[PDB]
Amino acid sequence: AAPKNRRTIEVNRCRRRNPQKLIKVKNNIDVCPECGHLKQKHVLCAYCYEKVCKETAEIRRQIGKQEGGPFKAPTIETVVLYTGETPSEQDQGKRIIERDRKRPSWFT
């Protein structure tokens, strides 16, 4: 079917600008106590998560170097190590991954 008459600006302005079609204010925002950036509650801090994922990205890169080719996932557990630290007695008998930097504060 086809419109029988042009809708006026006022009619349209009532459609468009009612509270239903408006953007609602979010009330669940907070400050990330860790980094001090803004995070939504119920959601992980975007900054903090990026930080983790950049670290874990590099760890996965070192995993590839040592593994060296597809279909070579080991049958032991894994541990990650940084500059100036040694595997414990219980750490013995599992895969070691080395690093060229200091251990992060948040990663313990």
């Binding site: 959601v43 992980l44 975007a46 670290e55 279909f71 996932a73 990650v80």
Partner: protein, 152 residues
């Protein structure tokens, strides 16, 4: 009408549904932590937990081997399942996987969840932490607890 419909329809049909979930599960096994759409993470999550229980049955179980064969596409992960993952979760009876909501995807604006198997090698996810016991309200509640215990 669809009350008490448990599984959510996903791919281009039930066969595809399984296939997507199997891919997700394969990834998670291998890498131990995976970002994917919130619905799909939630959906796959259950099958991930059920896989550890089949893994707990052991290599010797022929049924469990056939299951692992289907659900792991890499075939190199099957040893890992049975000799790494199953031994790791010996104590716990359940609750091997954790899921969290992370910021929405840039391109798509989709809800995104990270899922990881617990006690992995990787750097730990920033987790929701309840406030310290030394907070004003907690101290007042600890006050009330003191009253009740010391009354008898």
């Amino acid at each position: 009408i669809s009350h008490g419909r448990v599984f959510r329809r996903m791919g281009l049909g039930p066969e595809s549904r399984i296939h997507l979930l199997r891919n997700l599960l394969t990834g998670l096994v291998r890498h131990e932590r995976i970002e994917a759409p919130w619905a799909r993470v939630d959906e796959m999550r259950g099958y991930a937990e059920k896989l550890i229980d089949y893994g707990k049955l052991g290599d010797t179980n022929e049924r469990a081997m056939r299951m692992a064969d289907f659900w792991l596409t890499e075939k190199d992960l099957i040893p890992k399942l049975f000799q790494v993952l199953a031994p790791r979760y010996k104590d716990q009876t359940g609750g091997y996987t954790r899921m969290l909501q992370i910021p929405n995807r840039s391109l798509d604006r989709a809800k995104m969840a990270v899922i990881e198997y617990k006690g992995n090698c990787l750097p730990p996810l920033p987790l929701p932490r309840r406030d310290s016991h030394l907070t004003l309200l907690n101290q007042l509640l600890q006050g009330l607890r003191q009253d009740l215990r010391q009354s008898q």
